[PDB]
């Protein structure tokens, strides 16, 4: 198989909206949230049973007026490999999730 | 062999490059981030080993907002290998990681 | 010649409070200019943001950061000085 | 009978600060208690962190955030009130 970019971003979305959909920021909880978000996709794109290796990251940053900055290049084979990023605000925190799809 | 202790230094050398000894401000920031990722990449593809490489680098004004990350990955648990390092000044928390994988 | 009335902070920082106060006292004649002197001097050294009030009969209710507040007499001039924001 | 010397903020807020202070200035007789009453009341309404001075002789160098500063007299009694941090 290969790496459908939609069949990850639709799969990420659910994750995000599951874990942190319907609650604001709170320290005693955040890290267990990110913990889930990621260990949630993984549980989904491995059920998927593709000949792929994966990497999956989550940011969550409080909205307080700090200035965040993303940067991410890689070194794969552009034809076999691909990656999906996804961005998700509420009122009290932004959030960024990025899964990568390297082949064996 | 994914020499993690050695590729440790490689990342800490992505501060002896760009303004990894100045201070932070908005209009000039996205010059650094991208470049930190770039230079750390060349010095393992120059080595042309049988690895692929993903590499991310993140920057957040030291304002007093909370910051949290997640590192779930799925690979050959003997040849494939990760390295993440942290560096901050008085302006900014900075945080970088890189992933090598097989074949 | 100082009389400390109420102190939170710093000994060493306590000093630069009195020390540079004593200076404004002799450099400037008007309460407002004294204030401005001590404020800026402290914004510079100890990082924003500070607030100075100088007078003879005033009253005050303020919120400061732990270990960044002082209110003291120089001669018979009230000097209040604290960080908040 | 209240003169506004300098204001940043805000009709309603302004006139609310004014009409408050007057209450303050008839319940309480001690200058430091007048400040107390106003500072407290504002944290309640308009959110921390406010600061108040109430005096006949004083000057001030202060730093506030936008549309949250006021400085007026009630007869002779001057009120400084601003938000910061």
């Amino acid at each position: 198989s290969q790496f459908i970019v939609d069949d990850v971003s639709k799969t990420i979305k659910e994750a995000i909206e599951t874990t942190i959909g319907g609650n604001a920021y709170q320290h005693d909880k955040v890290n267990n949230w990110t913990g889930q978000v990621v260990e949630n996709c993984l549980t989904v794109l491995t059920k998927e049973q593709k000949p792929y290796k994966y990497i999956v990251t989550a940011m969550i940053m409080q909205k307080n007026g700090a200035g965040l900055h993303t940067a991410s290049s890689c070194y794969w084979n552009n034809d076999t490999d691909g990656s999906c990023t996804v961005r998700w605000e509420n009122k009290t925190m932004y959030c960024i999730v990025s899964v990568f799809g390297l082949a064996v | 062999q994914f020499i993690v202790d050695d590729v440790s230094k490689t990342i800490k050398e992505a501060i002896e490059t760009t303004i990894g000894g100045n201070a932070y401000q908005h209009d000039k920031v996205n010059n650094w981030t991208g470049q930190v990722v770039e230079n750390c990449l060349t010095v393992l593809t120059k080595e042309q080993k049988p690895y692929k490489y993903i590499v991310t680098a993140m920057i957040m004004q030291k304002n007093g907002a909370g910051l949290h990350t997640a590192s779930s990955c799925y690979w050959n648990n003997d040849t494939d290998g990760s390295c993440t390092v942290r560096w901050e000044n008085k302006t900014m928390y900075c945080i970088v990681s890189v992933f090598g994988l097989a074949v | 010649k100082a009389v400390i009335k109420n102190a939170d902070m710093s000994e060493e920082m306590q000093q630069d409070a009195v020390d540079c106060a004593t200076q404004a006292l002799e450099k400037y004649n008007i309460e407002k200019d004294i204030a401005a002197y001590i404020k800026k001097e402290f914004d510079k050294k100890y990082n924003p943001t500070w607030h100075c009030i100088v007078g003879r009969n005033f009253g005050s209710y303020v919120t400061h950061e732990t270990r960044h507040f002082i209110y003291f007499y120089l001669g018979q001039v009230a000097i209040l000085l604290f960080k908040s924001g | 009978k209240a003169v506004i010397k300098n204001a940043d903020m805000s009709e309603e807020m302004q006139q609310d600060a004014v009409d408050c202070a007057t209450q303050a200035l008839e319940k309480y007789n001690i200058e430091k208690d007048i400040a107390a009453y106003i500072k407290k009341e504002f944290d309640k309404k308009y959110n921390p962190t406010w600061h108040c001075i109430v005096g006949r002789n004083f000057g001030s160098y202060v730093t506030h955030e936008t549309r949250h500063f006021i400085y007026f007299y009630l007869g002779q009694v001057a009120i400084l009130l601003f938000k910061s941090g």
Binding site: - | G64, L67, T69, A70, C73 | Y61, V62, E65 | E31, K32
Partner: peptide
């Protein structure tokens, strides 16, 4: 073969420097 991994990690919450509330008057 292919497996899952950690989870390092990073977590840095806020701090909001403390603050006290003191009142003063003059003699």
């Amino acid at each position: 073969n292919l497996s899952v991994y950690n989870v390092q990690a990073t977590n840095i919450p806020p701090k909001e420097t403390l603050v006290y509330t003191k009142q003063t008057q003059t003699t």
